Structure 1
């Protein structure tokens, strides 16, 4: 199976797999059962922003999610990602719906990784920023139902022509180039990610959520990962 580290924006509480009884943000280390969660006052139909940060000295994966005019939600988990992830990874966004549904629209996405080595004022770095997506976005690997270009957005899950989100959908977008998160001469490794999202649902119970994830470079959507598994995991272990 894939190796997955993710920050989940979980819109639907599945209490039998350890979700709290409310929408929440969580840190997932190789399991959909988050190592840490925090309550998330999700807003149907409003544009939100998520930030993810980590560095190899502090070994703490942290995330913050907010909306304009509202307080934020934050979650952190102490973990050495070099003991979890391989040396080369791909980064991406994932989303799903199940019997309950929502739009999982990405309006922008940025990522920065830095490897600071032993040699004088070195730094290896990768940075990308999307503030709009075109219909043929060649530097994204789209998987499942994900599409780009509709209103210049990245639609991670299926939406009808009338704009209604569809259930039982799963889709991901990974940045085309592999990302180097560890090197033998590196003295500090760090990354940060930001994405803005629009989760819209005609229903009182939207599902299932959006995640920023880091994976083995050849990661693909696991079989049966619609719904609560967020397109990231093959089971709820």
Structure 2
């Protein structure tokens, strides 16, 4: 089994399994049933941005989602990732569609993690920034229905020639290199993530959502995780 820690941008309310009755953003720790959630005033057809942050001093996983000139949605949860996740992990982006669908497009993605290990001036750091994706992005691990190059964008789920969303689709993108998320010797550890997305459904009835996640290096799409399980969990517990 994998260990997933995610920040879902949930477009469809699945009250049958704990989702509030409106689109929302939330923090998921080893389960699809969020530990915290916030109402999200999603805008069909508009590009948004998600900013997720974390540091080992405060120990709070926070996220902000916004649209230009609109209001932002924020969610936070006090969690000590050292007691939840492996020391080495992989970071990625995931999306799905079920009976209902939307386009789960990624226009840009950035990530930075730093580990100050006790010593002065002895810091390990990792940073990548994709402002454009190519047909053969050799530094990404594509899973499910994910593809790159489509207008220099990253399409996580299946979209037809006529730019139309398809149902029952799941796709993930993981950065190639493993990331050292925490350590014991470190005096300060922190990470920062950011992405811009374009979710649009012609019927104006979207599903199911996008999720930024952190997992064990060898994570793969669970069977049956289409739709409401955001391609991250095996069951809805």
Into which bin does the TM-score normalised by the smaller protein fall?
Answer: over 0.9
Give the drift of 1:225: 0.6
Q: Which stretches in structure 1 are left out of the alignment for 5+ residues?
A: none
CA–CA distance in structure 2, aligned partners of residues 10 and 217 of structure 1: 25
Q: Secondary structure, in 3 states, of the residue corresponding to 2:194?
A: strand
Deviation at 1:202, TM superposition (A): 1.1
Task: Give the secondary-structure state (helix, strand or coil) at the position aligned to 2:151.
Answer: helix
* Deviation per residue, 1:91-131 (Å, 9 max, x gap): 00000000000000000000000001112211100000000
CA displacement 1:19-72 (0-9 Å, x = unmatched): 111000000000010000000000000000000000111111000000011000
1:228 is paired with a residue whose SS is: helix
1:16 is paired with a residue whose SS is helix
- Please give the per-residue CA displacement for 1:69-93, whole angstroms capped at 9, x wherever unaligned: 1000000011111111100000000
Which whole-Å deviations, capped at 9, do the CAs of 1:2-28 have from their partners, x for residues lacking one? 100000000000001111110000000
Q: Calculate the aligned-residue CA RMSD, in Å.
A: 0.6
- State TM-score, norm by structure 1: 0.99
Distance 1:30 1:59 in 2: 17
**Residue-pair matches, total:** 237
Can you list the C-alpha shifts for 1:182-209, whole angstroms capped at 9, x where unaligned? 1231111100100000001012320000
Q: CA deviation at 1:219?
A: 0.4
